[PDB]
């Protein structure tokens, strides 16, 4: 009756959305970019091999100065590195060794953590006493914290294992905004350059674009067929790349409201773990479970480079704000800088 | 800053991490008595029991690919949920990221199984049709004054778990089944001995002696 009509009308809405998207797909992006010359082979060397972590590393985040770095390991350590001199700027033990995410504030005065403890820990690095202490302990999530990004020094956006995202205020300490709608576990999120919008990928094979102020799911993309592990905006801010467990990467455009390109190969059967974009967005870097990273041409959907040297699964990947170098951390307790 | 990291590395390598996995009413907390620490023969074992997450165990379980062992506690008295326990054990055993971690199986509440099987209200044959075509293993060692029926049922359950364990490769990791009553003070000793065996096997594999 009413409920059957509810599913019927939802199905017809989905069909209408699919028809509209198909109508908007007048031409493919791959054929339009055929005219430009290929990027060619990309060669990168391991400039630095960062050592000192005990267990597997999950998260890293480059600083705004493109020199400081942060990493989180299962031994219970959050280490802030100086990439230029390979010196440990800071090394903070964690109350819970089960940490799966970390963040670095744009101002550089704060860092973030979070993991199986269901709690996001914010640490201050500019204490008057010159000792890093737990600045705040944000709690209220009923699932493990998978990603966290600092909007500013006052508010932070996190994603939890309870299929929800939360915008917290550091001064208040409470959930300023709650984003719900994801069916599967939310695994990663990215902040758009305009700071107004942000995408989130979950274990429902779908991505959702949310507005920070509105607090509602502005847009939804359903192109993947497996769990989504990573997401990152294009530098222009009008597109984003998503990596999933189905060994494919997909580029979506906010205005196009559908897929643009798919990056995959027959010999690849390992799911994506981390994705990132270059400074100009021409090169898309993707970590893989086959112990190596792949650099694809974002405009031709062909592999342009292979980054090898990790003997364990690559977990985190990050490109500097100026695009000078890219840092890759794997489950081998080592970080490698490539340029 | 480096000396503190060296001490942290020493203490981290000194202790051995275990992952406690068990459904409700199995009695996982009673095995030793959300983290617990104990010391046996001057070596420290830290057991982690995750219970604050949802039923989606696909993702966060990847955090436990470096633990020494997985203490899998299963209730052998409830002939109904047994199938769910077998499915969970098979999923844990056949995991891509848990293929190198040994599993120590604890059949908790053997006594309740005893009263249930002597009661006669519930028969294993109804839920396990292959129990009728089963015989007690020759190598099985029963207790003094111990009923053949209860040992037959418990060894049938143990062999049913061992079939799943041996279906996949056993060279990379092994399963150690044990019988646990309602309360036991030898659980820590059994865990210590099984960890001894696991680490010795890993050392021999590194030595190419096995």
């Amino acid at each position: 009756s009413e409920l059957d009509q509810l599913r019927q009308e939802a199905e017809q809405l989905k069909n209408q959305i699919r028809d509209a998207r198909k109508a908007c797909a007048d031409a493919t992006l791959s054929q339009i970019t055929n005219n430009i010359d290929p990027v060619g082979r990309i060669q990168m060397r391991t400039r630095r091999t960062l050592r000192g972590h005990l267990a597997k590393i999950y998260a890293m985040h480059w600083g705004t100065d493109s020199r400081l770095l942060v990493s989180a390991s299962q031994d219970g350590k959050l280490i802030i590195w100086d990439s230029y001199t390979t010196n440990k700027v800071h090394a903070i033990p964690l109350r819970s060794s089960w940490v799966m995410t970390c963040a670095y504030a744009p101002s550089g005065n704060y860092v973030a953590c979070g993991g199986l403890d269901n709690i996001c820990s914010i640490y201050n690095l500019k204490t008057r006493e010159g000792n890093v202490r737990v600045s705040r302990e944000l709690a209220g999530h009923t699932g493990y914290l998978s990603c966290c990004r600092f909007l500013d020094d006052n508010q932070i956006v996190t994603s939890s294992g309870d299929t929800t995202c939360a915008l917290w205020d550091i001064e208040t300490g409470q959930q300023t905004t709650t984003f719900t709608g994801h069916t599967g576990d939310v695994m990663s999120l990215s902040l758009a350059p305009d700071t107004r919008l942000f995408v989130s990928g979950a274990c429902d094979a779908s991505a959702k674009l949310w507005d920070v102020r509105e607090g509602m799911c502005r847009q939804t993309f359903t192109g993947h067929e497996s769990d989504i592990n990573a997401i990152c905006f294009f530098p222009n801010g009008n597109a984003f790349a998503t990596g999933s467990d189905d060994a494919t990467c997909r580029l979506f455009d906010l205005r196009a409201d559908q897929e643009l390109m798919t990056y995959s190969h027959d010999n690849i059967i390992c799911g994506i773990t981390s994705v990132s974009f270059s400074k100009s967005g021409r090169l898309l870097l993707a970590g893989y479970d086959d112990f190596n990273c792949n650099v694809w041409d974002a405009l031709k959907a062909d592999r342009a480079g292979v980054l090898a040297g990790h003997d364990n699964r690559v977990s985190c990947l990050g490109v500097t704000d100026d695009g000078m170098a890219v840092a890759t951390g794997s489950w081998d307790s080592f970080l490698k800088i490539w340029n | 800053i480096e000396k503190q990291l060296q001490k942290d590395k020493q203490v981290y390598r000194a202790t051995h991490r275990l992952l406690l996995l068990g459904a409700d009413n199995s009695g996982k907390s009673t095995i030793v008595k959300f983290e617990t620490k104990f010391q046996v023969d001057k070596v420290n074992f830290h057991m982690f029991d995750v219970g604050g997450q949802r039923d989606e165990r696909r993702k966060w379980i990847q955090c436990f690919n470096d633990v020494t062992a997985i203490i899998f506690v299963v209730d052998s008295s409830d002939y109904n949920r047994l199938q769910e326990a077998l499915n969970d054990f098979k999923s844990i055993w056949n995991n891509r990221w848990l293929r190198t971690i040994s599993v120590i199986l604890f059949l908790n509440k053997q006594d309740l199984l005893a009263e249930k099987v002597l009661a006669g209200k519930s028969k294993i044959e109804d839920y396990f049709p292959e129990f009728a075509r089963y015989t007690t293993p020759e190598d099985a060692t029963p207790e003094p004054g111990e009923d053949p029926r209860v040992t037959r049922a418990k060894y049938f359950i143990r062999d049913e778990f061992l079939r799943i364990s041996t279906a996949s490769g056993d060279g990379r990791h092994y399963c150690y089944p044990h019988f646990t009553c309602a309360v036991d003070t030898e659980n820590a000793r059994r865990i210590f001995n099984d960890c001894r065996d696991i680490i010795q096997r890993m050392h021999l594999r590194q030595y190419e002696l096995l």
């Epitope: 299929t163 069916t183 599967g184 274990c203 429902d204 094979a205 779908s206 067929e225 497996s226 769990d227 467990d245 189905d246 060994a247 059967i269 799911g271 | 949802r54 039923d55 989606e56 165990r57 696909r58 769910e84 499915n87 098979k90 999923s91 844990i92 055993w93 056949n94 995991n95 891509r96 996949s168």
Partner: nanobody, 128 residues
Framework: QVQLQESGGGLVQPGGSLRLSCAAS????????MNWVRQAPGKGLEWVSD????????SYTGSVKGRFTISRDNAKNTLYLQMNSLKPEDTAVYYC?????????????????????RGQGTQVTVSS
């Protein structure tokens, strides 16, 4: 988008035969292991059958071993579950679940009503 539509079932005489079909779209059916899970009224989800990618490996729960059969057709991306000699304990909602990890042996699809890769299911009941 991943879609798993279940068809068939309904009211059947005890001891009869029934056929359940599962149509899969949005993904390659041959690259994933398929499962059939039943939920009884007032009871949680339980796994009742599973079939591997190529169909070489097929397993059933103890309550249906031999009694039921499962098959897959990758040419038109379909799953079939044939049930013979229905019993009153078989009155349940059946779900065709495509577990997420491809090219893997294990997978989790018995989660409590929170699973994006499971169909709506069909009701199977026996006449009194």
């Amino acid at each position: 988008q991943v879609q798993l539509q279940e068809s068939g079932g309904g009211l059947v005489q005890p001891g009869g035969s029934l056929r359940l079909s599962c149509a899969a779209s949005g993904f390659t059916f041959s690259n994933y292991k398929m499962n059939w899970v039943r939920q009884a009224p007032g009871k949680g989800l339980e796994w009742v059958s599973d079939i591997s990618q190529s169909g070489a490996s097929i397993s059933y729960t103890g309550s249906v071993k031999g009694r039921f059969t499962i098959s897959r057709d990758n040419a038109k991306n379909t799953l079939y579950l044939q049930m013979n000699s229905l019993k009153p304990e078989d009155t349940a909602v059946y779900y065709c679940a495509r577990c997420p990890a491809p090219f893997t042996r294990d997978c989790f699809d018995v989660t409590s009503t929170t699973y994006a890769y499971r169909g709506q299911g069909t009701q199977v009941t026996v006449s009194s």
